[PDB]
Amino acid sequence: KETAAAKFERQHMDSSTSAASSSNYCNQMMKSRNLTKDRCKPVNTFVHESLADVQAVCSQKNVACKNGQTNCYQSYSTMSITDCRETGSSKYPNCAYKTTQANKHIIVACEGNPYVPVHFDASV
Ligand SMILES: [Au+]
């Protein structure tokens, strides 16, 4: 069983690229990170920062989670992110995505000991 922390790193971390490598990025990364396996994951965000910098958000600004839980944290600094958004043309198993790059504050849900990111909640 994949740990919640490892699943967060697979679904949301991409420290290799500074920003949305290309117009191809989401099509390749949604597939390579196994987010198009059983269905086309409809939206997903990748963060282009060090793992240590993303883990550190669990000690930053405490905010409400979209689901009403209290364990979400907002980054004090903006981070380089890529939003991936499934198109209309997109029909499983040929999942098609729009790659958008932005610099935004991330919001992540944290749990455990050690206290680490487990859920990408939002960017603002
Ligand atoms: Au800011």
Curated annotation (Swiss-Prot):
Glycans are attached at K1, K7, N34, K37, K41. Pancreas. One of its GO terms (molecular function) is RNA nuclease activity. It comes from the Eukaryota. The active site is at H12 (proton acceptor), H119 (proton donor). Substrate binds at K7, R10, K41, P42, V43, N44, T45, K66, R85. Disulfide bonds join C26-C84, C40-C95, C58-C110, C65-C72. Belongs to the pancreatic ribonuclease family. This is Ribonuclease pancreatic. It comes from Bos taurus.
